[PDB]
C-alpha cells in the first residue's frame, strides 16, 4: 500500500506518456482484461478509439498534474489527476480524470473506461468536431497599398472530353497553347496525369490580365487565393505561402489542415498574426448524436493586417533599377529609420510559387548561379570602399586624421614595407597630393589604408565599437549581426589596412549599413532601422562626433559635384546630393579571374529626408550601382523631404 501505490503511479504515468507520444497500442496494453468493473473494451478497440477521437481533434501534448493514487477494494486502487492537452481548437486545460487500477498478479493495469478519453464520456458516446477556417490577414505598405492580399484569381483549365477525339483534339490544344503562352507538350502532360478523368477540370495556368478568346475545351473559373501585386519586386521580403502538410499539423495543431502556411519572408515571420485562429466547436454527443457536453467552442478570428514602412512605388522602382542583375537596394528615411525599400535581385515569381509551380521552374530557381532566393538586403557583405566614410569619421574624432594634411602617394600600388610580400593596397587614380577631401572624391584606398595603420588597431576598434557590430536588430527579418572581423583582434597589419577601406573580414548586410551610415543624417546619432510602421523610433547617440559629420558631408557633396568625383553622373539630377561610391574585390573560386562588387551610398544633405544604399554583386564590366540610381533618387527626393 506504499510499494504498490508507488507502482500504480508508475502505471498511470506510463499510460499518460504512451498517449502523449501517440503510441496508442502501447497504452492499450496496460489495460485490464475486458469485463464488468474491469476494462470496458478490448485492446484493439481501445487503440481504435484513441486513434479516431484524438486523431480527429489533432490532440497533442497531453500533460498531467496533481496525481493521487489511493486504495479502494482489496485488489482495486483508485487514481485521479488533472490534465491539459492541445487540440486543433486551442488548449483544453483543467480536465478532471478518474479511474481505478487492478493488481491481479505481479503487474498493475488500468481498468480502462471511456472517461479516460474525455472525462464526461460514457458507454457509446461520440465526439464531434466542427471547424471554420480563418481568412489570412493582409500585408500593406506605409500608404495602405496591398503587398500580400487575398484576391480572386482567374484559373484557366481544360476538360478532356470537351477537347475532342482526334485531330479536332490536337487543333484545340494548339489553339490553347498559342492563346495563353503555354507549351502544348505540357498541356498534354497535364491532361494525362494519373488523377485525371475525362470529365474533370484540369487546371493549367493562372491568367493575370484580361481573358482572351476561349477555344473548345478551355474554360475560366474564379478561385480565391493569395495574391502578390508587386510580384518579383518584393518576393524576397514578402515571401510566399504554400499548402499545409500533415507534418505542419503534427508540429502545430492550431493550424488549419485545409489552409496555407507562410514558407519564407514576412509571410512566414508573421504567420501567427496573419493566419488568425480556427473557429468551431468540439463536443461530446449521445449514442444517437445529440449534444451532451461542449469541450471547446469559440468563433473564427480573422487574421490581423500588418502595415509596413515600405513604399510600394519605391520598392518597385528600386527593384527595376537593378535590371535583373545580382544586387540589392535599401532606402530609408534616416531620421526615423523607416525602411522604404528592400529590393533584392534577381528574384522569383511569388504568384507562380503559391499557385503551383512545376519541378522544372523551381529547379531553375535553385540552379541559377545568381541565386534568386537569397535575400540580399539581409546577407552580410564586405561593405566596400564606401566604408572609408566611417574610418574617416573615426579618424577625425580621435584626431588621427587632419583634414588638411596632404599625404604624398606615388603610383597605384602601396605597401607599408617588404614584409607584406607581393600584396599592395591599390587605388584607381594616380593623384600625387591627397588630403581627406581628395581621398573621398577619388575613392583613394591607399590614403585610407595609410591613415588606418597610423591610427592603429586600438583607436580604430574604439571607434567601430560605438556602432552596431554584434547587435541583433529588432527586425522580423532573419539576419546575422555585423562583424568587424572573425576574432577580436586583427593580428595583421594587412588585415587592419584592408578593414580601413571596407574589405578584410568585415561582414555588414545592406540594412545594417543603412543603419551605420545614418549617422551622417543625424549629426552623429545612429538611428536604428524600422520595418513595422507602428514601432517607436530607436536611436543611439554620440556614435561619431558632430564635428566629423560637418567635415565629411561637405566632401560627400563634392563626390557628386566635382567633375572628377566618382558619382559625378548624379549631378545631372540637379538635386542636393551627398554620395559615396565603393568597390570590393572578392575571390570567386569558380572564375578565379575575379569578382567585383559595386556600391553606392546617397542621401539628401539639406533635409535628411531619404537615404539610399545600393549594391551590384559580381558586376558586369562597365556597370555600376551609380548608373542605375537616378530613377530611385528622383523619386525619393520628390516624396521624402
Amino acid at each position: 500500500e506504499t510499494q504498490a501505490v508507488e507502482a500504480g503511479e508508475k502505471t498511470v504515468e506510463q499510460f499518460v506518456q504512451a498517449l502523449n507520444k501517440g503510441d496508442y497500442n502501447k497504452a492499450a496494453e496496460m489495460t485490464s482484461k475486458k469485463a464488468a468493473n474491469k476494462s470496458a473494451l478490448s485492446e484493439k478497440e481501445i487503440l481504435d478509439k484513441y486513434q479516431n477521437i484524438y486523431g480527429a481533434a489533432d490532440v497533442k501534448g497531453l500533460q498531467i498534474s496533481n496525481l493521487k493514487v489511493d486504495k479502494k477494494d482489496d485488489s482495486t486502487y483508485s487514481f485521479s489527476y488533472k490534465a491539459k492537452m492541445n487540440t486543433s481548437l486551442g488548449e483544453l486545460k483543467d480536465l478532471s480524470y478518474k479511474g481505478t487500477l487492478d493488481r491481479n498478479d505481479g503487474q498493475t493495469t488500468i481498468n480502462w473506461q471511456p472517461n479516460l478519453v474525455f472525462p464526461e464520456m460514457e458507454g457509446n458516446d461520440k465526439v464531434s468536431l466542427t471547424t471554420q477556417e480563418a481568412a489570412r490577414g493582409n500585408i500593406i505598405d506605409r500608404n495602405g497599398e496591398p503587398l500580400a492580399t487575398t484576391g480572386k484569381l482567374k484559373q484557366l483549365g481544360v476538360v478532356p472530353s470537351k477537347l475532342g477525339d482526334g485531330g479536332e483534339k490536337t487543333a484545340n490544344i494548339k489553339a490553347i497553347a498559342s492563346s495563353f503562352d503555354l507549351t502544348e507538350d505540357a498541356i498534354n502532360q497535364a491532361i494525362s496525369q494519373s488523377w485525371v478523368q475525362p470529365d474533370y477540370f484540369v487546371p493549367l495556368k493562372i491568367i493575370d490580365g484580361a481573358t482572351p478568346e476561349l477555344p473548345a475545351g478551355a474554360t475560366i473559373q474564379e478561385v480565391d487565393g493569395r495574391y502578390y501585386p508587386l510580384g518579383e519586386a518584393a518576393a524576397q521580403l514578402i515571401g510566399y505561402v504554400g499548402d499545409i502538410t500533415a507534418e505542419d499539423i503534427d508540429k502545430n495543431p492550431e493550424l488549419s489542415s485545409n489552409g496555407k502556411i507562410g514558407r519564407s519572408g514576412l509571410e512566414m515571420a508573421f504567420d501567427k498574426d496573419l493566419r488568425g485562429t480556427t473557429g468551431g466547436k468540439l463536443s461530446i454527443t449521445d449514442a444517437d448524436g445529440v449534444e451532451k457536453k461542449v469541450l471547446i467552442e469559440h468563433e473564427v478570428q480573422n487574421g490581423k493586417d500588418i502595415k509596413l514602412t515600405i513604399d510600394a512605388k519605391a520598392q518597385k522602382t528600386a527593384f527595376d533599377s537593378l535590371g535583373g542583375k545580382a544586387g540589392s537596394t535599401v532606402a530609408t528615411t534616416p531620421k526615423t529609420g523607416d525602411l522604404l525599400a528592400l529590393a533584392s535581385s534577381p528574384s522569383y515569381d511569388p504568384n507562380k510559387m503559391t499557385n503551383g509551380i512545376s519541378q522544372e521552374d523551381y529547379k531553375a530557381y535553385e540552379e541559377n548561379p545568381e541565386q534568386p532566393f537569397i535575400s540580399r538586403f539581409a546577407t552580410g557583405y564586405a561593405p566596400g570602399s564606401t566604408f572609408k566614410m566611417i574610418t574617416a569619421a573615426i579618424g577625425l574624432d580621435n584626431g588621427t586624421i587632419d583634414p588638411n594634411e596632404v599625404l604624398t602617394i606615388n603610383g597605384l600600388k602601396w605597401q607599408k614595407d617588404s614584409s607584406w610580400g607581393s600584396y599592395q593596397v591599390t587605388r584607381v587614380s594616380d593623384v600625387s597630393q591627397v588630403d581627406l577631401k581628395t581621398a573621398l572624391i577619388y575613392s583613394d584606398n591607399i590614403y585610407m589604408a595609410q591613415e588606418t595603420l597610423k591610427m592603429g588597431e586600438k583607436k580604430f576598434r574604439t571607434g567601430l565599437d560605438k556602432f552596431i557590430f554584434g547587435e541583433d536588430l529588432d527586425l522580423p527579418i532573419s539576419m546575422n549581426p555585423a562583424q568587424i572581423s572573425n576574432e577580436d583582434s586583427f593580428n595583421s597589419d594587412i588585415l587592419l589596412a584592408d578593414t580601413g577601406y571596407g574589405q578584410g573580414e568585415l561582414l555588414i548586410n545592406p540594412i545594417q549599413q543603412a543603419a551605420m551610415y545614418s549617422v551622417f543624417a543625424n549629426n552623429g546619432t545612429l538611428v536604428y532601422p524600422k520595418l513595422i510602421a507602428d514601432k517607436e523610433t530607436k536611436d543611439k547617440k554620440n556614435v561619431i562626433g558632430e564635428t566629423a559629420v560637418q567635415t565629411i558631408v561637405p566632401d560627400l557633396r563634392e563626390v557628386v559635384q566635382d567633375v572628377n568625383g566618382t558619382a559625378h553622373s548624379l549631378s545631372a539630377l540637379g538635386i542636393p546630393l551627398a554620395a559615396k561610391t565603393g568597390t570590393a574585390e572578392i575571390k570567386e573560386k569558380q572564375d578565379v579571374k575575379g569578382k567585383e562588387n559595386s556600391f553606392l551610398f546617397a542621401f539628401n544633405p539639406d533635409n535628411q529626408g531619404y537615404m539610399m544604399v545600393s549594391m551590384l554583386e559580381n558586376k558586369e564590366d562597365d556597370d555600376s550601382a551609380t548608373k542605375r540610381a537616378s530613377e530611385l533618387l528622383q523619386y525619393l527626393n520628390q516624396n521624402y523631404q
Side-chain angles (χ1 to χ4, degrees), residues 2 4-5 7-43 45-67 69-71 75-92 94-103 106 108-151 153-164 166-173 175-180 182-184 186-207 209-212 214-221 223-303 305-312 314-362 364-366 368-457 459-535 537-587 589-592 594 596-641:
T2 334
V5 154
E9 300 180 26
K10 186 190 176 179
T11 297
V12 169
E13 262 151 359
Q14 282 170 319
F15 182 75
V16 167
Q17 179 167 124
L19 292 187
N20 176 78
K21 291 189 292 180
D23 196 331
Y24 300 123
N25 176 66
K26 192 192 190 86
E29 288 181 359
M30 320 181 60
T31 56
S32 305
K33 62 184 177 185
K34 178 172 165 282
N37 277 32
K38 296 293 189 62
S39 299
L41 299 175
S42 66
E43 295 178 349
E45 282 180 304
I46 290 173
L47 196 167
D48 289 352
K49 205 147 189 67
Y50 278 119
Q51 203 168 244
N52 284 330
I53 294 178
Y54 284 3
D58 285 321
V59 176
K60 177 199 179 63
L62 182 62
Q63 303 168 11
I64 70 172
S65 58
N66 192 18
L67 183 56
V69 175
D70 318 292
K71 181 164 170 304
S75 187
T76 296
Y77 295 91
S78 71
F79 62 83
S80 46
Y81 58 80
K82 280 281 187 303
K84 62 179 189 177
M85 62 176 67
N86 195 19
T87 74
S88 48
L89 275 187
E91 196 77 14
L92 180 63
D94 213 65
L95 294 172
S96 299
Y97 284 86
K98 177 196 310 181
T100 57
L101 295 164
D102 179 65
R103 177 142 245 177
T108 291
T109 57
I110 298 130
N111 296 328
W112 192 93
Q113 293 293 306
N115 70 333
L116 300 189
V117 170
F118 290 120
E120 314 295 344
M121 287 193 52
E122 38 101 32
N124 284 329
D125 285 3
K126 325 290 180 196
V127 174
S128 176
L129 176 49
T130 298
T131 63
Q132 162 80 338
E133 197 179 357
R136 177 171 265 255
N138 289 14
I139 304 178
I140 53 184
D141 87 330
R142 65 187 298 106
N143 291 323
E145 234 62 39
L147 298 177
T149 186
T150 306
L153 316 172
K154 311 160 73 171
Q155 180 150 72
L156 174 71
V158 293
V159 189
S161 74
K162 307 193 72 174
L163 281 178
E168 178 70 4
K169 177 184 172 185
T170 318
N172 292 329
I173 296 183
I176 300 170
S178 293
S179 309
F180 298 94
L182 289 176
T183 314
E184 48 186 357
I187 287 185
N188 277 91
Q189 187 194 349
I191 72 179
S192 57
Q193 293 294 348
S194 60
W195 70 267
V196 181
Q197 279 161 22
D199 281 322
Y200 281 174
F201 172 90
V202 179
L204 299 171
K205 169 187 169 197
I206 300 296
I207 68 172
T211 159
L214 286 180
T219 162
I220 299 300
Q221 298 185 357
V223 293
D224 280 3
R226 198 65 150 169
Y227 177 63
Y228 306 98
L230 282 191
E232 298 192 334
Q236 288 84 1
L237 173 62
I238 295 316
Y240 69 100
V241 291
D243 286 326
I244 295 200
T245 73
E247 277 200 21
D248 289 323
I249 287 289
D250 185 60
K251 275 205 54 181
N252 184 24
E254 323 212 16
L255 297 182
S256 171
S257 50
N258 215 42
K260 303 280 195 170
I261 184 169
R263 290 307 196 193
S264 84
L266 294 175
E267 292 271 37
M268 178 188 58
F270 283 132
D271 191 62
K272 192 189 201 76
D273 304 328
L274 278 166
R275 67 182 190 248
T277 48
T278 307
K281 170 203 293 171
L282 177 73
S283 52
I284 306 180
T285 63
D286 290 336
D288 35 59
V290 161
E291 179 174 301
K292 158 185 183 185
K293 171 62 166 299
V294 174
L295 295 186
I296 305 169
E297 170 185 354
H298 51 81
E299 302 193 335
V300 52
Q301 269 178 324
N302 289 326
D305 284 7
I306 291 200
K307 196 183 183 181
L308 305 178
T309 47
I310 300 291
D311 179 330
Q315 179 77 23
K316 188 190 171 186
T317 286
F319 177 80
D320 294 338
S321 285
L322 292 178
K325 313 303 174 190
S328 68
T329 309
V330 174
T332 70
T333 64
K335 293 209 299 279
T336 68
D338 284 45
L339 290 162
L340 298 176
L342 293 182
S344 194
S345 189
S347 193
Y348 63 95
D349 191 356
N351 298 319
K352 208 75 183 61
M353 205 69 188
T354 187
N355 299 335
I357 196 186
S358 66
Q359 288 283 68
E360 264 191 345
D361 288 7
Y362 178 73
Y365 286 149
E366 272 183 323
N368 188 322
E370 292 180 349
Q371 285 293 278
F373 286 144
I374 293 184
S375 287
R376 290 185 148 84
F377 50 77
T379 295
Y381 298 106
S385 42
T386 314
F387 198 76
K388 293 204 260 62
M389 314 184 292
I390 304 297
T391 302
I394 295 171
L396 301 176
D397 283 346
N398 60 33
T400 301
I401 293 180
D402 184 7
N404 296 126
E405 171 183 354
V406 172
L407 293 183
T408 300
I409 305 168
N410 298 314
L412 299 167
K413 318 276 189 186
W414 180 89
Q415 69 178 13
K416 183 180 203 170
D417 56 61
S418 49
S419 75
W420 290 21
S422 66
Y423 178 73
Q424 294 180 108
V425 185
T426 303
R427 60 181 186 161
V428 276
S429 290
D430 186 353
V431 172
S432 189
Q433 306 302 302
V434 182
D435 63 336
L436 178 58
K437 179 178 174 180
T438 300
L440 301 179
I441 291 173
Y442 286 82
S443 191
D444 191 308
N445 304 331
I446 294 184
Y447 177 86
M448 206 61 69
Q450 286 195 24
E451 293 296 330
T452 303
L453 291 169
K454 280 289 148 288
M455 192 184 314
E457 175 167 11
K459 298 184 179 190
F460 187 41
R461 286 186 180 276
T462 296
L464 292 164
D465 292 331
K466 296 200 185 69
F467 283 86
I468 61 179
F469 295 103
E471 295 195 13
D472 285 75
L473 304 188
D474 188 308
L475 280 179
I477 300 181
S478 192
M479 64 186 59
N480 289 284
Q483 71 169 36
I484 294 172
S485 54
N486 293 352
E487 305 306 320
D488 287 353
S489 306
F490 291 120
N491 296 118
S492 173
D493 273 353
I494 290 176
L495 184 59
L496 170 61
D498 287 351
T499 309
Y501 60 108
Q503 318 281 320
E505 290 165 6
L506 286 177
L507 288 170
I508 310 173
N509 65 63
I511 290 167
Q512 299 163 331
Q513 296 171 34
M516 287 180 47
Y517 297 169
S518 80
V519 294
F520 300 109
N522 301 275
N523 312 274
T525 290
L526 186 148
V527 172
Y528 287 98
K530 165 211 297 182
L531 183 53
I532 310 303
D534 64 22
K535 277 194 190 159
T537 294
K538 182 180 177 184
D539 61 9
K540 179 172 181 180
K541 298 183 180 302
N542 300 325
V543 173
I544 61 174
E546 187 175 327
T547 306
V549 173
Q550 290 167 343
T551 302
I552 287 174
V553 181
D555 294 6
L556 298 179
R557 295 174 188 261
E558 279 296 296
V559 175
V560 190
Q561 285 307 137
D562 192 298
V563 64
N564 277 328
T566 60
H568 181 60
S569 60
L570 299 184
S571 68
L573 294 176
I575 69 188
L577 267 184
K580 184 61 184 79
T581 70
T583 73
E585 205 79 36
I586 334 288
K587 186 247 191 311
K589 208 163 182 64
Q590 331 120 79
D591 193 23
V592 285
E596 191 173 350
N597 293 331
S598 173
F599 301 83
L600 170 57
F601 163 70
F603 75 108
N604 189 308
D606 289 356
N607 54 38
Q608 296 82 22
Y610 67 88
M611 170 175 288
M612 168 191 195
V613 169
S614 179
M615 182 203 55
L616 229 60
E617 182 179 8
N618 188 27
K619 74 174 212 179
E620 301 173 342
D621 289 336
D622 310 324
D623 203 12
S624 78
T626 302
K627 69 150 59 51
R628 299 173 174 281
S630 43
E631 291 175 350
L632 182 64
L633 284 174
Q634 287 187 263
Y635 177 86
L636 294 181
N637 186 79
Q638 277 292 316
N639 299 273
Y640 294 93
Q641 258 92 14

